[PDB]
Design a protein around this ligand. Structure first.
Ligand SMILES: OC[C@H]1O[C@H](O[C@H]2[C@@H](O)[C@H](O)[C@@H](CO)O[C@@H]2O)[C@@H](O)[C@@H](O)[C@@H]1O
Ligand SMILES: [Ca+2]
Ligand SMILES: [Ca+2]
Ligand SMILES: [Ca+2]
Ligand SMILES: [Ca+2]
Lengths: 226, 58
C-alpha cells in the first residue's frame, strides 16, 4: 500500500521545538521536556510522568507510525517504561505509563519493570480498552494483553525504533532493537487480528518512573496515512 | 535554486515535508497549518505528503 506522510501528527528534530518551548501540533504535559532533537518524556528522576499527544485528531482508516526512542539508565534494571497510543481521548495526565486510564483505543507498552515477578521483562505489550477497563499496573497488564513479545529496549548503542501498523483490522508491531544503524532492520514482535479502534483519535506518547527511573527520550514520531 | 530546495532538507532525503516546511515558515498554529496545507495541495502532485525537486521547481 501507498504511504502518505502526515506532518500534523508527527514530530522530529533537528528543530523539534518552537522558540516558545512548544512542539508544533502536539500538546505536552507532566514532566516531559521538548528540546531541539528529542523529547525527554520522563526524566531519570523519582515518580515522574509525562506525555505528548496530538492536538487535532486524525481520520485515517489504516495507518503506520514509526517511533524512535532511547530508554537509558545506570542499572541493568530500570523503570518504568514507555507507551505509544492511539485513542479517542487525549490521555495527558494519568497512572498509565504517565497517561490517563479508561482509554478508548489501543496502547503499546514498553515495560522496563517486572512488576508481577515473572522474570518476563523488559517487554512490549498491546492492550485494548473500550472506555471502561483499568490497566493492571502491578500485573504488567498480562491478562489484558491482546498480544505481546519480549525485547530488551534499554541501553542500546543506536536508538530503538518501533513500527506500528494498522492495516485492515490488524495492528502490527515490528521493532528494531538499536543494535544496527539500519533504521529499517526491523524484526517481528507481535500482531492483533480483527481489531477495531476509533474512526478518529489522537496519537500519543508517554512515560513514567517511580522507585526506579530512566530517561525516556523520543527522537521522532512519524505518522502515515496508508 | 537547488540550494533552496535543500536549505531545509534537514534529514537529507531530497524531499521536503510538512515539518521541514514548518521551520522555514517559523505565529498561530492554525495559520501555520494553513500555509503548509496550501503548499501541499499546490505542489504535491502524488499525495505521498512530500515534495521532490520536480514538484518544488514546477
Ligand atoms: O513507593 C515507591 C513507589 O511505588 C510506586 O512505584 C512502584 C512501582 O509502581 C514501580 O513499578 C517500581 C519502579 O519504579 O517502583 C515502585 O515499587 C509508585 O506509587 C511511586 O510513585 C512510589 O513512589
Ligand atoms: Ca511494569
Ligand atoms: Ca511482567
Ligand atoms: Ca526530508
Ligand atoms: Ca510528492
Amino acid at each position: 500500500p501507498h504511504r502518505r506522510f502526515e506532518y500534523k501528527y508527527s514530530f522530529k528534530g533537528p528543530h523539534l521545538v518552537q522558540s516558545d518551548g512548544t512542539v508544533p501540533f502536539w500538546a505536552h504535559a507532566g514532566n516531559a521536556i521538548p528540546s531541539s532533537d528529542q523529547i525527554r518524556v520522563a526524566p531519570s528522576l523519582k515518580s515522574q510522568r509525562g506525555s505528548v499527544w496530538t492536538k487535532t485528531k486524525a481520520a485515517f482508516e489504516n495507518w503506520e507510525v514509526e517511533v524512535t526512542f532511547r530508554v537509558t539508565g545506570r542499572g541493568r534494571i530500570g523503570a518504568d517504561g514507555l507507551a505509544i497510543w492511539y485513542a479517542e481521548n487525549q490521555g495527558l495526565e494519568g497512572p498509565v505509563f504517565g497517561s490517563a486510564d479508561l482509554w478508548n483505543g489501543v496502547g503499546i507498552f514498553f515495560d522496563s519493570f517486572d512488576n508481577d515477578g515473572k522474570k518476563n521483562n523488559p517487554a512490549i505489550v498491546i492492550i485494548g480498552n473500550n472506555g471502561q477497563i483499568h490497566y493492571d499496573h502491578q500485573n504488567d497488564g498480562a491478562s489484558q494483553a491482546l498480544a505481546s513479545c519480549q525485547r530488551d529496549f534499554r541501553n542500546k548503542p543506536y536508538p530503538v525504533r518501533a513500527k506500528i501498523t494498522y492495516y485492515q483490522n490488524t495492528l502490527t508491531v515490528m521493532i528494531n532493537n538499536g543494535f544496527t544503524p539500519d533504521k529499517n532492520d526491523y524484526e517481528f514482535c507481535a500482531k492483533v487480528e480483527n481489531m477495531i479502534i476509533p474512526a478518529q483519535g489522537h496519537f500519543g506518547i508517554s512515560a513514567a518512573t517511580g522507585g526506579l527511573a530512566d530517561d525516556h527520550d523520543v527522537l521522532s514520531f512519524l505518522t502515515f496515512q496508508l | 535554486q537547488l540550494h533552496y530546495f535543500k536549505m531545509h532538507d534537514y534529514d537529507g532525503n531530497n524531499l521536503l515535508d510538512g515539518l521541514e516546511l514548518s521551520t522555514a515558515i517559523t505565529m498561530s498554529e492554525d495559520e501555520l497549518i494553513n500555509i503548509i496545507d496550501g503548499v501541499l495541495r499546490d505542489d504535491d502532485k502524488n499525495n505521498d505528503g512530500y515534495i521532490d525537486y520536480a514538484e518544488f521547481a514546477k
